[PDB]
Symmetry: C4
Subunit: 442 residues, 4 copies
Amino acid sequence: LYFQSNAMWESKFVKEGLTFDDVLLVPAKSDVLPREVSVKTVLSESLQLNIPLISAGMDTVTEADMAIAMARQGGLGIIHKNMSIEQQAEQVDKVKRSESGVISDPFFLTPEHQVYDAEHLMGKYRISGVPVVNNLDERKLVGIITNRDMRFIQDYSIKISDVMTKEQLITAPVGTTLSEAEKILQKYKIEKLPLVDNNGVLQGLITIKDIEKVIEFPNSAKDKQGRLLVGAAVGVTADAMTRIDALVKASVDAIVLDTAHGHSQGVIDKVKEVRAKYPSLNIIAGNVATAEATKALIEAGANVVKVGIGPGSICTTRVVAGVGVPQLTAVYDCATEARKHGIPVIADGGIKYSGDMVKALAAGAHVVMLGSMFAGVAESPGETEIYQGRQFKVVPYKGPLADTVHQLVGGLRAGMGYCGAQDLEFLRENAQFIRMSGAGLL
Amino acid sequence: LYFQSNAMWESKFVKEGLTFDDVLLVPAKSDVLPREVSVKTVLSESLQLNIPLISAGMDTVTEADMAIAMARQGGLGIIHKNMSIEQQAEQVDKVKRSESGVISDPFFLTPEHQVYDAEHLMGKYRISGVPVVNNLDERKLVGIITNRDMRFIQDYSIKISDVMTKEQLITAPVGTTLSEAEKILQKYKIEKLPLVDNNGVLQGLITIKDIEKVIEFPNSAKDKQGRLLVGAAVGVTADAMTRIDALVKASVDAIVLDTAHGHSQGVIDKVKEVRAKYPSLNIIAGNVATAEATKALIEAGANVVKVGIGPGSICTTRVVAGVGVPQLTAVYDCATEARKHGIPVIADGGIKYSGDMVKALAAGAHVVMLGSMFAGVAESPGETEIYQGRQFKVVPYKGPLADTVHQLVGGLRAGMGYCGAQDLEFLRENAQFIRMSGAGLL
Amino acid sequence: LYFQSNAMWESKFVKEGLTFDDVLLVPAKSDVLPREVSVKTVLSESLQLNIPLISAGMDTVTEADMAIAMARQGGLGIIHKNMSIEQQAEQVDKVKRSESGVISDPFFLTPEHQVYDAEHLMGKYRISGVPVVNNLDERKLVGIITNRDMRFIQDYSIKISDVMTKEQLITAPVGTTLSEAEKILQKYKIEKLPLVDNNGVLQGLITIKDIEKVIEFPNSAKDKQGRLLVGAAVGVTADAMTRIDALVKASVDAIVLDTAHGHSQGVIDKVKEVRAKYPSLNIIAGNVATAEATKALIEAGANVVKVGIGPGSICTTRVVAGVGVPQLTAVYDCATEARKHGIPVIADGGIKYSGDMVKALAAGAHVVMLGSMFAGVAESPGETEIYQGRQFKVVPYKGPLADTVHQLVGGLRAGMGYCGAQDLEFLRENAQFIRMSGAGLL
Amino acid sequence: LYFQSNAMWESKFVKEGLTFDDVLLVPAKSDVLPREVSVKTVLSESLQLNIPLISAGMDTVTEADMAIAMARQGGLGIIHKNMSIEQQAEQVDKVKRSESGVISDPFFLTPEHQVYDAEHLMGKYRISGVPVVNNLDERKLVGIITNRDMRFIQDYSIKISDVMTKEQLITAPVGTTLSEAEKILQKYKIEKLPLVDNNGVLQGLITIKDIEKVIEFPNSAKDKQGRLLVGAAVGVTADAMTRIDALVKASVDAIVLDTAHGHSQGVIDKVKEVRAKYPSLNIIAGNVATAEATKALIEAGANVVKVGIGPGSICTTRVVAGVGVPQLTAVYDCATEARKHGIPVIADGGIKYSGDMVKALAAGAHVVMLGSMFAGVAESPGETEIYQGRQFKVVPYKGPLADTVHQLVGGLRAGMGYCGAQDLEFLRENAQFIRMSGAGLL
Ligand SMILES: O=c1[nH]cnc2c1ncn2[C@@H]1O[C@H](COP(=O)(O)O)[C@@H](O)[C@H]1O
Ligand SMILES: O=c1[nH]cnc2c1ncn2[C@@H]1O[C@H](COP(=O)(O)O)[C@@H](O)[C@H]1O
Ligand SMILES: O=c1[nH]cnc2c1ncn2[C@@H]1O[C@H](COP(=O)(O)O)[C@@H](O)[C@H]1O
Ligand SMILES: O=c1[nH]cnc2c1ncn2[C@@H]1O[C@H](COP(=O)(O)O)[C@@H](O)[C@H]1O
């Protein structure tokens, strides 16, 4: 009575899937050394990473310090949502203002503010000077209070007019760039360069640190104005939009609309809704494990699709619900769909060693997301303690993020050398795998 | 000389089968939240469960206390056969009379009975009042002896005429329902409501507990008269019928005709025989692992087929006899046959975690049976002891049945959310699996 | 230039094979209870076993005591070749004469022999009487010296004429059978019945033990004259024939021409040679693992083919030489060839539990051979000691052979019940397997 | 727009590969005993081995003592490159001059040299005599200083003219062979036989040791002039040629141009370049794991191809880069290509037991290379120490190379017996494998 009414019944057991340990990458003809290989990857025009790594949006993984360390390495951190909306937008603000933060949109105080406000702004952003203007209306620059002024201030409750030295200031015009500022800073022997207009109105501030961080971290992943990229997690809930609004106002570069099952009508509706209010916002949506789910999220408006159901190290999804797809099959199936739209995928979960990362990228993902490999690095949230004669996060202490990133990227370049891939696109398009038994694993 | 005489020889090694750890369920488009999902399942018109769980017919698993706890949770207990016929029918009687038990067919005493008979009836059924009638012939209600009367009785050997307070009784008519009784009980401030006819003849009794248990356990699996469902195990033996007769007279809702190999002529004959004497009796017959065995038991008259040979945790069948079928293949093969007849299957054995249960239902079973997951819960038979600083059953103590059921059902709803299944029928019909290697398990 | 010159190169990796843990037997419709099932199997007209078990021809497994215990259970022992030719033929002689041994071909002494010769013959055969005749020429019976005569003899160096009581003897005629003898023994109240002809010439002896052992072991595997069956191992070497000659003269029922690689021209030549000198001798030849090797040994004249290369528990063949075939594939491939000739196969090696035995028979073997499962039973060679608070063979002590056989056969009957097999032929012809993953094993 | 533009994408997961534990060799008809089997193998006309074993070019495996022990056993050692060019050529020189070293191109001293130079030459080569000539121009033999002369010399700083006994010397002509020399040495009762021309000019030296070593090691792998074969590792680097030049001048028999990824344009260019400068030099090039890489190295001019990426015991290649091919598939795929050119392959890495070696040769390699199986033998580099009550290399001490070689070759002959292979060519061409599950491994 119905065409192939028994089709769904008969296909129950047909699909097979492969995980990382089921395969190896086959060496191919290579003209390129691992060090000359390119690890850059573009998630979109406004998200351009210099290494294909994202730190997960978990409370044991990414807050502002992690997001800053990641972007400095060329990757992207995703600030977790296990805090209030204001706290999350503030975390975003700290990443965006870490460097090149106040060049076009400076903070400032009047002489009538207390030295407390200076300590607050310098503590909050880790910027060592606060411009001072005559009043909040004209905003004419009368001076600056710096970390060096604070050396001599005992009580902080006093007016800034009291403590402010009236000294000859060096200013530069609006539009002064970093490399120009570096010369002006070198010339007059100063660490701070307020930018003003023709009327003496403060438009901006450049610091020696804005210049030093460019040198210290040449691989930083930055926006068009030179500020570190940052993402932020958002749940699918009634208040998602309120949360997104505050993040966008804090100048977040991407939101991750994250849920256990991305293939639900609620998630699709939420992406449609966020896409409509914000045509240009980078929307990473997940989590999905099928070609059909990938197509639905893309057509709802997601521009990055996040892949993985069940592979996560601490996910009970497989044991409790019986649900999952082996991660390489999931990445490959989703990338097969997403390729047709020009849409990149993130491989989220189940990565143990750098080799797994190489495999995930070779199976078609543009980028991998790591929680557990990053949870013990120094910049992750949570305190250090010594307990077993061992330093711990309160999980084994891994040291600075940079050491872990360096090993991951080293592994990736090696893998790329073997596969003859000069860049990640060639790797996704061309790399071949060979399947092996469990005996082939040992 | 014979058509395909070598066919049986050549097919020896052809079949493959899959067990729980060989597969995962694939997420599908979902419009439905895990909490709004329906876990109800119908085994037949007279057996309707509110969660798809049955407690096994083993002496370490199910006696009256377990059967009562299970049915209260919405499932079904199967009283084991490792006791005498009278003991088993009595166990059945206790479950059926746990609540709403005496509404149409009350127990009663005369004034000439001893208070011992009252203690016995109240102990046996956990019902706190015993109606008293003038004589066994007219059965005219003269009073009631309750748990509160017993507070003041020291010696129990005395006549009930001595101890019975002559007090104004409140009675209601035959056909009074629970929700009516609740109002009458509230109004006159009483805990017991004998039901009588126009001549004062006792027809029944309702208690506040009959009303309270409906509220306390809104998911109870009950018969048409509001009594807890119960099953009972029967062996295939010469005295099976004698045993079945007593169980049916005790108002059992199903019998499980249980044997190691259900595919034997003796079992088929026994089902034919029981079906013939009792056209309406629910007959669960097992155990089978093939489509052919399923068809034979169905045509013999079984209305539920029990599936599993060798997967049971304590079965030596695989090691000793070399025999078995991987449980998901068994469930699927049997359900493929049983679907054609509109007959449900029970997946019996080999379930470790809730995920396995989700998989068994997704492979086509209507219901799973669990022995070992239930053997340590409080309501299972056997005493508590402390031994290793650990509470034990004399096996690790799992606490109340309700805690274990809550985790199982939580896992099931999650799995159903992932698969987009609003109800168990959709799950059986539509859920897809993906096969994975042993590396995909880790 | 050559037809398919690359065929051998391209087929290198094509074959797959299965071992015991790769499969389970599928239950089939059964009309037959495990206890009414027949476990008999015929290796040839002159070798008919009552259980399908053979004890291996290893020095830690089978000497006369083991061979006797095995045949009593219905199986066959194979006396190992790690002794001299005379020692091996003597071991064979002890098995054949264990019961019904001296009925047609008696030992005897004259009065001039010492009591030492009586002790020797009674010790050697465990027969408690020695017939005495007047001289080696007439062989006329003058009396008998028994275990009871020995009670009173202190010095054994004396002439038998001295110690022999002249007492009225009861004799029976030649051709007297056991059941007749039992009545004559009961009637005259005696334990020994010499058989003589019309002239008083000793032809034979029957003892109460010949009669008692028939009752004690109703399943004994016996030859046409009522003596226990026994086999013996022979190597392929220059002196094989000399060894075979002595075994045949000792009335061995089978020889096992045993070598690591049975598929060699030397083995085939040796079978051809032994077949030619002894047209009726049972020749078990091995070891082979392929259909082609099975055909070659059969056409060389072997009437039983022994199967297994590498599965043996203590074989290093797989690790050292890299060689082997998974045992069930080997059994099946060899049985496929051997079936065409009406030739039975023995599955030798790799059996751990009774389930494996059921599987080997279901894959087509008529009989399984066990070394390591038997090496600790009481009747195996080697002394008992207590060492770790544990009794040991000098390997864990398993107790009497009968206990191990009873568990094996119990497992076999169960398996046969499940498969609906009334006899081993039906099992070989009809049993089906299902393949499972390593996850299906756990 | 492009023919099969999606082909590379769709083939990603198609290949399967097998490692040693995935398979066993199938026994085949055999006419040949393991001891009469030939284990010889030809890598080229100028490299002819008597056992198919090469010791790896690692600093924990092969220096001069190892290379000498290996060639004496019939195999080939590869001197590692983790030393300077001069040190490596010197190591090569010691192997080539170990025996038959000075027959055509002798070292010599004048009377004006110190006894220090004699000690040096005798220490360096382990040759117990140094010819002495009148001057470096005529090179007329005036005498010889031997190990026996040194017994009486206390101070070594003295002129050789002082210490040299003027004694009647026995000389033989140029072209005198070893077997001739043996007779002359026996006849005149001497241990040293200088070879001279008609004018008394030293052309050469034969020692009793040159003769004794032929007897002691009848299986030595030697060049055309009777000197032990030796190989040497070279990296692909700017100074490779400078290194190769010195090795060729030291009369190396092969170079191994060794790199992690042999399939790179740099390696191919380097082979082309070395092939062009040295048309006759044996070039072993690696490492490759594919048919395409094998063809490229062969056409670049390599005459031996080395196979294996990732199987090496201490390689992190699989875990770190995610790259590799299961070793038997790699050997088979490469041998399939190399067969077409008449080119042999070396199976490098992943060999644990002798069985694995048999499998690698049966999959098509002419020879296996072993690092880790040899790293603890006595002749490997590094000191002995006792630490845990255990002798160690500073890794468990394996004793003399000869003991390990004897077990490997024993395993190989056994495997060859089973496969019916009289020689390694037949094994490569004809041996068949059977695939097994992980359950078939246990
Ligand atoms: O609490 C959980 N519920 C659902 N998914 C989780 C949870 N924790 C982690 N994950 C997922 O697993 C990933 C972590 O991958 P990891 O590198 O294997 O630990 C996260 O980015 C999430 O996608
Ligand atoms: O004694 C046994 N003999 C045969 N089957 C058994 C026995 N014990 C348990 N079983 C089976 O195994 C099931 C228990 O499944 P479990 O949840 O894995 O322990 C029971 O419901 C029976 O079907
Ligand atoms: O020493 C050995 N060399 C070759 N085959 C052996 C040896 N020991 C035992 N076997 C074989 O392995 C069988 C024993 O099987 P088991 O029951 O697994 O121990 C014997 O009957 C022989 O076929
Ligand atoms: O340091 C390493 N880097 C790359 N390859 C290596 C290294 N060490 C050993 N190998 C390879 O692994 C082989 C050793 O094989 P083994 O017998 O498994 O230890 C060597 O001959 C090399 O081909």
